[PDB]
RNA sequence: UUUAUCAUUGAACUAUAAUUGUUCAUUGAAGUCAUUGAUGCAAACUCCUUGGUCACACACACAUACGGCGCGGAAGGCGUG
C-alpha cells in the first residue's frame, strides 16, 4: 500500500528494535530542485515531524544538502521516502500535491552518501568509482516504497558507523562544489 | 569514556547587552600523523627463547616437626692456607 504512515507503522511493528538510534550516524543526501517554493513547503511539512536536531537542510547558493544526524533506523525510512518520492513526483504526477502519499507508478530512485568509515558486516548498492574523496555513495533503484522501506531497514540494521569530526558536513559541501565546478 | 583551531568582516538570530549566545559565507595566520586513532578495562588464543628434561627409586613420614646421609652444575655467605 502506497501510504508511508501505513508502511511506517508496519515497519515499527515488525523490525526488531527499529526505534533505537544508531550511534555516530550521518547520512547526506544532496538534491536539486527547479522550484524552491514547493520544496521549502515539503521541508516544513517534514520538519513538523522529523525535528530540527535530527534533520537539517543547507542550501548552497538550486542545490540543497539534506543531512541526517543520529537518526533512528525508523526515521531514515520516513525521510528518504518522502524526499525521493517528492523528487520523482515533480516530474511524474505534478497535480496531486500531497506529500505523504506516493502515487502509483512511482519507483524510488536516487543516491545518498554515508561517511567512508562505516562497516557493513539487493536494492541499495554501493558504487564503484565514487567522485567525493572521503565519502561513500550508495544508489537505491526501482523500489515501490513498501520494498524501499523494507530495504532501508535491512540496510541500516547491519551498518555501523564510527567517530566522524564535528565539521564533516562543511567538508562534504566543499568537495561536492569543487567537483561540479570542475565539470 | 573523550578529543579535532585562532583572528577580521558582512548577514539572520535570540537579548539585561557594546551586540555575550546560535547558524552561513569571506580575508589572514599558524597546522606531527592518526579518529579503523588516543585513553581506561579485561579476557581468550597462537607462537618464540631459556632449563640436569642426571642417577637410584613408585616407597607410609613427622614435635627437637620432618636422616639437608647419591653425583654434578649456577649463584652468593663465611673460614683456613
Curated annotation (Swiss-Prot):
<comment type="function">
    <text>Component of the U1 snRNP particle, which recognizes and binds the 5'-splice site of pre-mRNA. Together with other non-snRNP factors, U1 snRNP forms the spliceosomal commitment complex, that targets pre-mRNA to the splicing pathway.</text>
</comment>
<protein>
    <recommendedName>
        <fullName>56 kDa U1 small nuclear ribonucleoprotein component</fullName>
    </recommendedName>
</protein>
<comment type="subunit">
    <text>Component of the 18S U1 snRNP particle, a subcomplex of the spliceosome. Interacts with the nuclear cap-binding complex CBC1-CBC2 (yCBC). Directly contacts intronic sequences of substrate pre-RNA.</text>
</comment>
Amino acid at each position: 500500500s502506497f501510504d508511508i504512515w501505513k508502511n511506517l507503522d508496519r515497519i515499527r511493528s515488525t523490525k526488531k528494535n527499529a526505534g533505537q538510534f544508531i550511534k555516530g550516524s550521518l547520512l547526506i543526501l544532496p538534491m536539486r530542485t527547479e522550484d524552491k517554493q514547493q520544496f521549502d513547503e515539503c521541508m516544513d511539512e517534514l520538519h513538523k515531524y522529523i525535528s530540527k536536531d535530527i534533520l537539517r537542510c543547507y542550501p548552497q547558493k538550486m542545490l540543497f544538502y539534506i543531512v541526517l544526524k543520529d537518526f533512528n533506523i525508523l526515521d531514515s525510512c520516513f525521510v528518504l521516502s518522502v524526499l525521493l518520492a517528492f523528487q520523482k513526483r515533480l516530474w511524474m504526477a505534478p497535480s496531486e500535491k500531497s506529500y505523504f502519499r506516493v502515487p502509483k507508478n512511482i519507483n524510488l530512485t536516487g543516491s545518498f552518501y554515508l561517511p567512508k568509515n562505516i562497516e557493513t558486516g539487493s536494492s541499495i548498492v554501493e558504487v564503484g568509482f565514487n567522485v567525493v574523496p572521503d565519502f561513500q555513495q550508495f544508489q537505491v533503484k526501482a523500489c515501490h516504497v513498501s520494498k524501499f522501506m523494507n530495504e532501508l531497514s535491512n540496510f541500516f540494521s547491519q551498518v555501523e558507523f564510527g567517530k566522524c569530526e564535528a565539521n564533516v558536513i562543511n567538508y562534504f559541501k566543499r568537495e561536492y562544489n569543487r567537483t561540479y565546478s570542475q565539470i
